[PDB]
Amino acid sequence: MATLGGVHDSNSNPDTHSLARFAVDQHNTKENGLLELVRVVEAREQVVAGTLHHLVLEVLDAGKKKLYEAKIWVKPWMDFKQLQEFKHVRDVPSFTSSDLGAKTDDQVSGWRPVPVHDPVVQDAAHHAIKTIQERSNSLFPYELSEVVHANAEVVDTSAKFDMLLKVKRGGKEEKYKVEVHKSTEEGGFNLKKVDLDHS
């Protein structure tokens, strides 16, 4: 259980080198496999929704040196550090003076809930809200208003989605349950059933 917070920069005082190894080993083992840590570059810190570890080191890509940065997400409460991802940068303090950002389009499976307001939840929610109401007939009254809590589940083949949000209509406020399935290359989502939350 350890964290950190304080937007700044250093010269890799602590064991920052090892920190980068864990990050690369994570991506390298899952989808990567062509990055070789050569020599640490620098160590930067920043507070992001709790704790953010920004490290930069010179790696080897297929036999070509290059500086890459790795971001690690940590929290004080849970006190569990986890590497988010690293992007290929250039010999500069910024992202090669270009746009890099972060991307996440990798498959995943497992019986576990899901965050809120995310691109995956907000997507299924908005789709479910309109789909459900449309499932009765051709119409488009309201859409996603405010998500309370969403959770994902792994079915025999597809993936169930149990979430709860509030809908608006003429200045009203009512919560309801939603159950949608997740499919790949099947058009998108497949709303299973729906329920109301007022009992």
Amino acid at 129: I
CA–CA separation, 193 vs 5, rounded Å? 44
In 3D, which of 188, 96, 113, 177 has the Cα closest to residue 150? 113
CA–CA separation, 111 vs 39, rounded Å? 39
Q: Per residue in 158-183, is it b (16+ CB within 10 Å) or e — as a string? A: bbebebbbebeeeeeeeebebbbbbe
3-class state of residue 128 by DSSP = helix
Residue 177 sits in the same domain as residue 145:
yes
CA–CA separation, 96 vs 90, rounded Å? 5
How many residues are there in the chain?
Answer: 199
Picking from 96, 120, 154, the residue at the C-terminal end of a domain is 96
How many CA atoms are closer than 13 Å to the CA of 123, on its beta-carbon side? 9
CA–CA separation, 117 vs 131, rounded Å? 18
The domain total for the chain is 2
Picking from 39, 61, 96, the residue at the C-terminal end of a domain is 96
Residue 122 sits in the same domain as residue 196:
yes
**Across the strands, what pairs with 68?**
57, 88
Residue 121 sits in the same domain as residue 176:
yes
Method: NMR
In 3D, which of 102, 105, 124, 128 has the Cα closest to residue 115? 124
Residue 87 sits in the same domain as residue 116:
no
CA–CA separation, 67 vs 91, rounded Å? 6
Residue 64 sits in the same domain as residue 117:
no
Residue 81 sits in the same domain as residue 159:
no
Provide the domain limits for residue 138. 112-199
Is residue 2 situated within a structural domain?
A: yes
Amino acid at 80: F
